[PDB]
Amino acid sequence: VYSYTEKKRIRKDFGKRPQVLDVPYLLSIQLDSFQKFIEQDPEGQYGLEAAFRSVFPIQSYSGNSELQYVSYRLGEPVFDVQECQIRGVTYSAPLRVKLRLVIYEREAPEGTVKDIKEQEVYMGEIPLMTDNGTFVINGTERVIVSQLHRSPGVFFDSDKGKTHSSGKVLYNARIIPYRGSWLDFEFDPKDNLFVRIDRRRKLPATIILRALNYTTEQILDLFFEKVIFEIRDNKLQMELVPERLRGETASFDIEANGKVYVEKGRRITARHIRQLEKDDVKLIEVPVEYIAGKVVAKDYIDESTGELICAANMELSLDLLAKLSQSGHKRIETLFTNDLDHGPYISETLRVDPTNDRLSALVEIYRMMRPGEPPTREAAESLFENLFFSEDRYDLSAVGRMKFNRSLLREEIEGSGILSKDDIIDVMKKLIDIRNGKGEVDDIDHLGNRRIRSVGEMAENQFRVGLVRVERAVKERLSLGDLDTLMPQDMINAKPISAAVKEFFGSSQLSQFMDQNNPLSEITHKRRISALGPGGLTRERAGFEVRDVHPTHYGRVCPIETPEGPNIGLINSLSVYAQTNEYGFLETPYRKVTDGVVTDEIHYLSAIEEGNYVIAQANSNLDEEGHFVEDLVTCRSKGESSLFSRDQVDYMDVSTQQVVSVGASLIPFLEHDDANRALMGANMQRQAVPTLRADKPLVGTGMERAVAVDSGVTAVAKRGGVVQYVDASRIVIKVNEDEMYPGEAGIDIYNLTKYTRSNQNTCINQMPCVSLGEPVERGDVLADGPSTDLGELALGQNMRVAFMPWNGYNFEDSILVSERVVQEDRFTTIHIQELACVSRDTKLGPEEITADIPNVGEAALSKLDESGIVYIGAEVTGGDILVGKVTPKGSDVKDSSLRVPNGVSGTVIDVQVFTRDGVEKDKRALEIEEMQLKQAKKDLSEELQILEAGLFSRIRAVLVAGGVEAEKLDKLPRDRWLELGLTDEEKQNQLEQLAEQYDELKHEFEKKLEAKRRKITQGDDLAPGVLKIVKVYLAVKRRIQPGDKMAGRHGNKGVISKINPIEDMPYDENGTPVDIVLNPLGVPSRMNIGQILETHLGMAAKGIGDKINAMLKQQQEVAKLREFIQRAYDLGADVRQKVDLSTFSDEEVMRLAENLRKGMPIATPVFDGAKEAEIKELLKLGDLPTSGQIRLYDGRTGEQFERPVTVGYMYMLKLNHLVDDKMHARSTGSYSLVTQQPLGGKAQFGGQRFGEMEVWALEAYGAAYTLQEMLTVKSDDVNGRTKMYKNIVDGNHQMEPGMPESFNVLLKEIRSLGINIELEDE
Amino acid sequence: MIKGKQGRFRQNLLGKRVDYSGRSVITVGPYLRLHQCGLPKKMALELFKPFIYGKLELRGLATTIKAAKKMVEREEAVVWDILDEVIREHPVLLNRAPTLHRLGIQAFEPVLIEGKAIQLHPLVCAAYNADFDGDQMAVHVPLTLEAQLEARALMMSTNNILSPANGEPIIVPSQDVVLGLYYMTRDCVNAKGEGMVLTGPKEAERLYRSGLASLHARVKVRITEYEKDANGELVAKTSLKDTTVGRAILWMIVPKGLPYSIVNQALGKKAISKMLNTCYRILGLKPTVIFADQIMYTGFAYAARSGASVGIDDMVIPEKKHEIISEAEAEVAEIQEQFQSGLVTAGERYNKVIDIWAAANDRVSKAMMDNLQTETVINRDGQEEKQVSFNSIYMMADSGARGSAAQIRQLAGMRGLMAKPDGSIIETPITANFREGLNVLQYFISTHGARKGLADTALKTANSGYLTRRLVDVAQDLVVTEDDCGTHEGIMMTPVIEGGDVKEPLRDRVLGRVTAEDVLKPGTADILVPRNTLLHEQWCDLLEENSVDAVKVRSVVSCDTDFGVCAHCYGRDLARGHIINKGEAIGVIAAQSIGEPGTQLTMRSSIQVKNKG
DNA sequence: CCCTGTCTGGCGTCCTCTCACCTATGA
DNA sequence: TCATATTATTACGCCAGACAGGG
Ligand SMILES: [Zn+2]
């Protein structure tokens, strides 16, 4: 079964693997994020409720008043989106917050407040999101791009080689909070442990332990295990668990139980450890040279004399043993400092530490953090207890606590946001374990360690900044609060929240201007994952590995769609199937594989889960049950693509598109292209201009439908049904009854956006693709947008291309084009330019909008009215006048009248004017006022009458259970109608019900039309300051010409060189010329062989189209057409499509065959595409030669090209790098102010920067005079250039050079220091 | 305001913005002669406004300057003749935007273009590194009269036919024209007109055009080659060469002095480069300019007549490829069955797997290379006989137009063992080429390997440019300022030998450098060359005949000149045949010639004899 | 007193094109 | 409108060059 615009032109779909999961809605990142930001979500997470439950209730410092929260709301926007783009306002909503002030008496923590007050106060306006994922910030339509940043939680990084210049590795460990202070631990090459906070000075790390109220003995209890020396019969024996001897040299005689176990000299092996454990060896008598290097663990004091023997962490000598042995401390605890495993890093750090107690530790930390200003007990304790341990200024989020517990192998995943003692101690323990050998480092490119911020998270963080500023303001006003004479807007202020949130949505590194020239380009700028932005890395610094593709990108980030240039691999684009995790990570679908049978259930994984499992490949042959048909299958285990068994796998890839994105999965035959040319192909495919006549890629991938629907450029039907099709203004859809609400009778009226300006000066235009009285279903398309054709996606157009050298005109990458391409207007794109004119009151009175243009004669008053301004429409070019806008006293008049820029033509399509309340002459301003005034009422009544007509009929329709008397129901016409009684049995109050409808309709229409006139009757609506505001919309129509840039989908760039006549083209023996000749020499080097298979398969597609065009032109009854269409849709191997063609009612075969006579469209999906034998077999169904190559004659000489050439249909696109936006020349005009050199650019009429390497190139020749005029006369020296212009126009090519002006600018800037630079003797 | 990249030195005093300048997108226009370029009419009327004003005021059509500015603002019918009379002999400086060496600013004569795109002669593109994928160039106008003469006499595009970094010609025919020549001068074992005899090259082209022979059909012709064996006198020798039809047609374009054996071979790209080089060394500059143009015209014309496409059938899969892959799969199966039983170590396993996949890759490449280089087997009057193939991708590879062994290898044979960004190789290769489909994992490993290359170029270019900057600012001063420093010291140029076969011969190192003391002939105490002779090609051939050991030659670092380098201790001019002139800045051309290849460079037991002596 | 980690400064590609956005305060 | 005058983030990579520390 198919929908009704699916039976229009059903694309022949190759593809063997049955898809199990359909493509998700391609704009779901932006929409789900911003729907999380604004939503009334009780339990607080996440959203605006999290912000209000963090900041509220505010209580002042015992001020006995506590403003609390109830509920918030967003009212209607005062401007809908279209008039918002026209006017220039933000597309925002007012944020109505209920606030409840309660005020206490004296001594009321528990006492009832003395008075309350509560109001729906107004703070800020937040910009809402348009239904397509965009904002409208100041008239322009902008997009917030999702950031990719390091997750909160601990990271163990190495930096193995570069420091110390000695090959010794370090190991640092960064505890990155979501909000607050950064804490880093790091080794130094003396093997000492150092802490630093916020990249400040370096403190030896155990001072932070001494800041957490840990004595030295507790620290040594933590990071070291005790070795027990017992004072015994002789020589102070040792408890020895045999694990501690692993891998060391036996220094002494190892004997016990009257038996010599291990002698001196040999290393202790694990067999000797087994001997000591089997022989149960713990207590052995040591020599005195064994204890002479060890370190004591805890303190010991001489008991009788009452003083100290040794401090904790002290190495031992023999006389120290003579001190402690004679006192009476029988147990001696020593620190086991294994040189292999258990290193003495904490102990040597304690030897570096200049502190001894907690208080000096806090004083040293306070002198680190805030220097100069003294370190007192209260100040240092408040500093360190609010560094990490308070809920205000340090907060690992839920993501941070999950990563923090996961990297430390904790059991739980939810905990408190602040740190604790045990967390810092665990980070130090894991860092020490990594130094010892056990456990390993983390990498930063691993996408399980890399979170995504999106629109709702970033706007929520900015909103929380605004709320903490307004709570500091509320704490300010409340302690100065006098009661009861204030209500909660003398306390609260709508200014900082609105200021912060407009600061983010206006001027941020991620709220950026939408690339809008294409439905692809909109939908792939909204799905963008940037590494840049605040808190992330920069373009000009880093690096090599963060610009590189890591094995966790499989199915999360597109490997091949990243922009070439200064930021490669920072501006990654998101994959097709990849959602976003609850915590913000990238989870991608996989198919759960319990046993041999691959189950059709899906299950989402992130990169910290994808490593543990074994995940199959998308294309591994499985037949009729899910069993892998091989006994071994290529999978990947832990980022390593390897071959595993038939029955080990736990997951399989869902579909074979899922590695790449929606820009580079529209490229058919992707798997045959090179990676570089697929990158250049996707990046150019974003840049296509919408042509005037949209044309359906013959070789597509089938993802055109989802991109053209999911990007909101087409008018997808909301509720299904039929159609009324007024359409000149709007599509009117009558709704079928099942999808139709009981009240609100209701028919859907779709607004078509006709010719208007895009963000890239292209033309966004919608055209209805459904006729009158034609069924449509829910989700079906109704109006084709820019670059769409019946709901598909038509960026460029499909043309007949020959691969051959043709007389040098396609030399390096150039492209030689027939005249049949430029006669048919099949690339003639439409550009629209907005031009503003304002008459601001700079000085010496205000400027004026009058045609009475001066000095200039009967060449001003022409394309305008008698009162000034361009008169609309017209064939305006360059140097014309659009808006007469000149002042007197500025015989002292001038010409600021905004004219048409140099080189452009066009037609004035629209003139907008919300000017300084006065623009009118004696009456046009109020003349049109009456026109709109009468317009509103007309439609207002019309619509009511339209429904009235439908209701009147409905009244009679229902008039059967309560008066069906046809001759007794046609009484009053426009007066009343139904007048019958009923009583009970069946409910027929319908008449009464519909009576209310009409009654309310007229009653509401009056009010509806009452406000209409009110709105109509007005000067105009805009902001203040600016006075004369005249915007004129030209529309140039640019065709194609030698110098434009065209390109296919594979990376084959080209500058169209010669626009040949039709005759000189290479025609085949049938007679048709070829349209575009490309060059075969690009194909062996640039290894993008996919354009040839697109060429052959498009040739086969148009072969079927020519065959259907013959069978339908030379008209046959529909049996032969349905037989040939059925053969065309069966065609070859096992596919997914076949068709159910004998259910197309003998007319939907014919409408399909009317829409196929330009070529049968073929879906070649991304990595499961059409094989070559099917291309040959499809070329045999059409009557074309199997090789793909036709013999071609030459249009010049009439004689055959030897060795037959390739002709086919490639889908070639026109990129928006047009040659009459690049052509520029300058002889003489205006310059800058500071310098005497020419200005730069094209919009400024400026000259070429003759840069540094061109000066070196002229020095490389003997061009001393060319360089002398190149930097003195042509550029800078003012006397030289005026003398040169007069010398040229006299006929004397001679320069009088002088000295450059910018060098005298250099002399004054150097001399304006204390520097006396001069110019010496003659 | 002083320091930095955007101070006054680097932004307003060393580089300035410039009037009488323009900029637009380039395109080909192959009808041009190589001293002229196409320049649009709109840019031409804007750049030449004062010359047009002066011309209009000379005729007497107008009076005041205003009238002339209204005339060209309206663009009447008479200013286009004025424009063709200000263009005619007035060169312009075309400039591609990343100018690295001095061949990136060249002066042309304009030919006016209906259009909006600069038409640029194709051979000159290999100097600018200019393809036509959206490039842009700037035009500058030499205003004064000394600058017009410097554009014609120093910077003209006919004057830059040798790269200043070496002796190699920079107007080498790039890509379409070598395919047209390689298809033209070739042969096949049977065609129309096999083994017929022709009375000249004129009727060879007449037999090709009328339709009686083929472009490659072996034939005895009678050609008259002019060998100039006397002292400046050209002696005619006429003979019958067993050659083809295409070699005679290409002999109609060769100038007089070159011998016929320069076209008798198959003419790839190295052969056409040394054809233009021998023409420049024998017949000088003007026949080499006109012969470079005639090469380009006949290459484009017969490449158009060739119809040399590319198809899907042209990439011939080896029939032996699948059995090679199965033998490699059996070998990795044996190694992993030893790995389950623990007989071998892990590093030796990884080394054995990379070794057998390298061996299988080389065998697949040899299978496809035999299957492409001699696939054509056509009979002539009897049994079969083999020849080199006319496969399209093989002529695009063998001609040296575009393609190598590696790229044609990746389109037919397996595309090797791609490496992960860890730097170590991946033990499971990409056994599928591009004609067969890559599946998902293989394309992802390919994207590892290609993203690393794009990141390397886009970060390598900054270090390459900063290296050229440091080099031209250490050089910056050094000007050829004498004619002889009057010394006897100079470095000892030997051929360099690393331990393999002799890498760079002495004729590459002592070509065009003036000897320090007089080289003794290797026999005994003979004055073979004198002590201040420039060693051009004739002297270097008389050095190679006598097998001279090593030459003590004068080097720039031994020059005794205070504040500059004398003219003998530099050497040959390198883009001029003679010695360096008194004046020509050699520090800047040297710094550009070292730093300009900075892009092409990368960024990131006992002795066994080989020969017998 | 001669090695030495450690800290501080100083580099990091040319040319071009499009767009938007610009200090608070205040009797 | 016309004088008043500066604070609560961190996440480059060498590579010279100068400086306090210590055998
Ligand atoms: Zn010298």
| Chain B residue with the nearest C-alpha to that of A659 | B440
Q: What is the DSSP-derived secondary structure letter of residue B216?
A: S
Edge-first strand order for the sheet with A602-605 is A602-605, A588-592, A651-653
Q: Do residue A1081 and residue B438 have CB atoms under 8 angstroms apart?
A: no
User: B592 vs chain A: nearest CA distance in angstroms?
Assistant: 8
Nearest to A1255 by CA among B383, B472, B69: B472
Question: Which residues, listed in sequence order, are joined to residue B111 by a DSSP beta bridge?
Answer: B38
**Which residue in B19, B22, B43 is closest to A1274 by CB distance?**
B19
Neighbours of A549 (CB within 10 A): 27
Distance in Å from D20's C1' to A186's CA comes to 23
For residue A771, count CB atoms less than 10 angstroms from its CB and return exposed for 0-12, middle for 13-18, buried for 19 or more. Answer: exposed
Question: Cα dihedral angle (B291, B294, B298, B301), rounded to 10 degrees?
Answer: 160
CB B552 within 8 A of CB B519: yes
Please name the nucleotide lying closest to A545, CA to C1': D12
What is the C-alpha end-to-end distance of chain B, expressed in Å? 68
Q: What three-state secondary structure class fits B136?
A: strand
CB B260 within 8 A of CB B223: yes
Please list every residue in chain B whose beta carbon sits closer than 8 Å to the beta carbon of residue A1043: 24-25, 27, 115-117
**Which residue in B12, B142, B397 is closest to A1235 by CB distance?**
B12
Please name the helix (run of DSSP H) or strand (run of DSSP E) that holds residue B47, with its range, or none.
helix B41-47
CA gap B464, B459 in Å, rounded = 9
CA gap A1305, A1278 in Å, rounded = 13
Distance of CA A1029 to the CA centre of its chain: 34
CB A988 within 8 A of CB A982: yes
Distance in Å from C8's C1' to A201's CA comes to 14
CA gap B189, B217 in Å, rounded = 8
Q: What three-state secondary structure class fits A38?
A: coil
The answer to whether A25 CB is within 7 Å of strand D is no
**Residue A947 φ then ψ, to 5°:** -65, -40
Please list every residue in chain A whose beta carbon sits closer than 8 Å to the beta carbon of residue B49: 1227-1228
**Which residue in B51, B310, B453 is closest to A1206 by CB distance?**
B310
Tell me which of A444, A445, A1060, A1081 to substitute to probe the interface with B (most B C-beta atoms closer than 10 Å): A1081
Q: Give the Å distance between the CA of A959 and the centre of ligand 1.
A: 118
Q: Give the Å distance between the CA of B467 and the centre of ligand 1.
A: 27
User: A510 vs chain B: nearest CA distance in angstroms?
Assistant: 23
Please name the nucleotide lying closest to B599, CA to C1': C13
Half-sphere exposure of A1293 (CA within 13 A, CB side): 17
Query: Number of helices (H) and strands (E), helices first, in chain A?
Result: 30, 53
Q: What three-state secondary structure class fits A1113?
A: helix
Tell me which of A1226, A1245, A1286 to substitute to probe the interface with B (most B C-beta atoms closer than 10 Å): A1226
Q: Do residue B440 and residue A1309 have CB atoms under 8 angstroms apart?
A: no
Please list every residue in chain B whose beta carbon sits closer than 8 Å to the beta carbon of residue A1288: 50-51, 53-54, 143
CB B72 within 8 A of CB A879: no
Position A860, amino acid:
A
- Residues in chain B after which the chain is broken, C→N over 2.5 Å: 604
Neighbours of A24 (CB within 10 A): 14
Please list every residue in chain A whose beta carbon sits closer than 8 Å to the beta carbon of residue B9: 1306
Q: Give the Å distance between the CA of B7 and the centre of ligand 1.
A: 38
Q: Which fold has domain B312-454?
A: Topoisomerase I; Chain A, domain 4 (1.10.132)
**Residue A342 φ then ψ, to 5°:** -90, 85
Question: Cα dihedral angle (A36, A37, A42, A45), rounded to 10 degrees?
Answer: 80
Distance in Å from D18's C1' to A383's CA comes to 36
Length of chain B equals 613
Distance of CA A1030 to the CA centre of its chain: 35
Nearest to A151 by CA among A545, A528, A444, A570: A444
Distance in Å from C6's C1' to A162's CA comes to 15
CA gap A788, A704 in Å, rounded = 9
**Which residue in A676, A1079, A1261 is closest to B154 by CB distance?**
A1261
**Which residues 195-214 of A interface with strand D at a CB distance below 7 A?**
198-200
Q: Are strands B197-198 and B219-227 parallel, antiparallel or unpaired?
A: parallel
Integer-rounded Cα Rg, in Å, for chain B is: 30
DSSP annotation string for A986-1031: S--THHHHHHHHHHHHHHHHHHHHHHHHHHHSSS----SS----EE
Distance in Å from C8's C1' to B178's CA comes to 58
The answer to whether A150 CB is within 7 Å of strand D is yes
Q: What three-state secondary structure class fits B290?
A: helix
Q: Do residue B435 and residue A1172 have CB atoms under 8 angstroms apart?
A: yes
What angle in degrees, to the nearest 10, is found between the helix axes of B286-306 and B270-283?
Answer: 150
Please name the nucleotide lying closest to A1252, CA to C1': C14
Tell me which of A1254, A1281, A1284, A1309 to substitute to probe the interface with B (most B C-beta atoms closer than 10 Å): A1254
Nearest to B269 by CA among B164, B126, B366, B412: B126
**Which residue in A1080, A1238, A1239 is closest to B308 by CB distance?**
A1080
Question: Which residues, listed in sequence order, are joined to residue B25 by a DSSP beta bridge?
Answer: B136
> What string of H, E and C letters represents the secondary structure of A665-729?
CCCCCHHHCCHHHHHHHHHHHCCECCCCCCECCCEECCCHHHHHHHCCCCCECCCCECCCCCCCC
Instruction: A579-585: list long-range contacts, CB under 8 Å, 24+ apart.
Output: A579/A24, A579/A28, A579/A604, A580/A29, A580/A32, A580/A452, A580/A454, A581/A606, A583/A398, A583/A399, A583/A402, A583/A451, A584/A399, A584/A451, A584/A452, A584/A453, A584/A454, A584/A457, A585/A151, A585/A447, A585/A448, A585/A450, A585/A451, A585/A452
Residue the block writes with tokens 């001399």? A1311
CB B303 within 8 A of CB B295: no
CA gap A1143, B193 in Å, rounded = 63
Instruction: B193-202: list long-range contacts, CB under 8 Å, 24+ apart.
Output: B193/B217, B193/B219, B193/B245, B194/B218, B194/B219, B194/B380, B195/B219, B195/B220, B197/B221, B197/B240, B198/B222, B198/B245, B198/B248, B200/B248, B201/B248, B201/B249, B201/B251, B201/B252, B202/B252
Neighbours of A271 (CB within 10 A): 8
Question: Which residues, listed in sequence order, are joined to residue A801 by a DSSP beta bridge?
Answer: A1076, A1208
> What string of H, E and C letters represents the secondary structure of A1266-1315?
HHHHHHHHCCCCHHHHHHHHHHHHHCCCCCCCCCCHHHHHHHHHHHCCCC
The dihedral region occupied by A139, where left means phi > 0, alpha psi between -120 and 50, and beta the remainder, is: left
Domains parsed from chain A with CATH numbers: 25-151+444-574 (no CATH), 152-224+343-443 (3.90.1110.10), 225-342 (no CATH), 575-655 (2.30.150.10), 656-712+788-827+1039-1222 (2.40.270.10), 713-787 (2.40.50.100), 828-919+1020-1038 (2.40.50.150), 920-1019 (6.10.140.1670), 1237-1322 (no CATH)
CB A569 within 8 A of CB A547: yes
Q: What is the DSSP-derived secondary structure letter of residue B293?
A: H
Please list every residue in chain A whose beta carbon sits closer than 8 Å to the beta carbon of residue B150: 1261-1266
CA gap A94, A83 in Å, rounded = 17
Extract the tokens encoding A14: 């190759």
CB A868 within 8 A of CB A896: no
Extract the tokens encoding A774: 């034609």
Length of chain A equals 1322
CB B378 within 8 A of CB B372: no
Beta strands in A111-208 (DSSP E): 115-127, 135-136, 141-144, 146-150, 153-157, 172-176, 183-188, 192-197, 203-204
**What residue is closest to D9 (Cα–C1')?**
A198
The set of residues, in sequence order, having a beta carbon less than 8 Å from that of A892 and lying 6+ positions away, is none
The answer to whether A1007 CB is within 7 Å of strand D is no
CA gap A54, B123 in Å, rounded = 71
CA gap B54, B31 in Å, rounded = 32
CB A755 within 8 A of CB A1035: yes
A425-437 b/e with 16+ CB inside 10 Å = b?
A: bbbbebbbbbbee
Extract the tokens encoding B149: 């003469």
Residue the block writes with tokens 């790098």? A1217
Beta strands in B505-591 (DSSP E): 520-521, 526-527, 551-552
| Chain A residue with the nearest C-alpha to that of B8 | A1306
Q: Are strands B118-119 and A767-768 parallel, antiparallel or unpaired?
A: unpaired
Q: Are strands A730-734 and A699-700 parallel, antiparallel or unpaired?
A: unpaired
Residue the block writes with tokens 């005062």? A78
The set of residues, in sequence order, having a beta carbon less than 8 Å from that of B235 and lying 6+ positions away, is B226, B227, B228, B229
For residue A276, count CB atoms less than 10 angstroms from its CB and return exposed for 0-12, middle for 13-18, buried for 19 or more. Answer: buried
Neighbours of A506 (CB within 10 A): 14
CA gap A1022, A1057 in Å, rounded = 48
**What residue is closest to C22 (Cα–C1')?**
A507
CB A589 within 8 A of CB A658: yes
Extract the tokens encoding A832: 């629209």
Chain D: positions less than 7 Å from a protein CB are 9-14
> What string of H, E and C letters represents the secondary structure of A569-607?
CCCCEECCCCCCCCCCCCCEEEEECCCCECCCCEEEECH
Question: Which residues, listed in sequence order, are joined to residue B479 by a DSSP beta bridge?
Answer: B585
CB A1033 within 8 A of CB A909: yes
Distance of CA A396 to the CA centre of its chain: 25
Extract the tokens encoding A587: 């989870």
**Residue A1130 φ then ψ, to 5°:** -85, -70
Q: Do residue B151 and residue A1266 have CB atoms under 8 angstroms apart?
A: yes
Half-sphere exposure of B544 (CA within 13 A, CB side): 15
CA gap A489, B158 in Å, rounded = 81
Extract the tokens encoding A395: 């907060």
CA gap A707, A692 in Å, rounded = 20
DSSP annotation string for A425-484: HHHHHHHHHHHHTSS----SS-TTSEEEE-HHHHHHHHHHHHHHHHHHHHHHHHHT--TT
Resolution of the model in angstroms = 3.7
CA gap A1152, A1145 in Å, rounded = 12
Neighbours of A338 (CB within 10 A): 16
CA gap A12, A1152 in Å, rounded = 12
Q: What is the DSSP-derived secondary structure letter of residue A549?
A: -
Q: Are strands A141-144 and A1053-1059 parallel, antiparallel or unpaired?
A: unpaired
CA gap B44, B116 in Å, rounded = 10
Q: What is the DSSP-derived secondary structure letter of residue A24?
A: P
**CA dist A121 → A42, A69, A116, A127, A921 (Å):** 21, 11, 15, 18, 44
CA gap B284, B258 in Å, rounded = 12
Nearest to B359 by CA among B341, B332, B338, B378: B332
Edge-first strand order for the sheet with A12-13 is A12-13, A1162-1163, A699-700
Positive or negative CA dihedral for B398, B399, B404, B408? negative
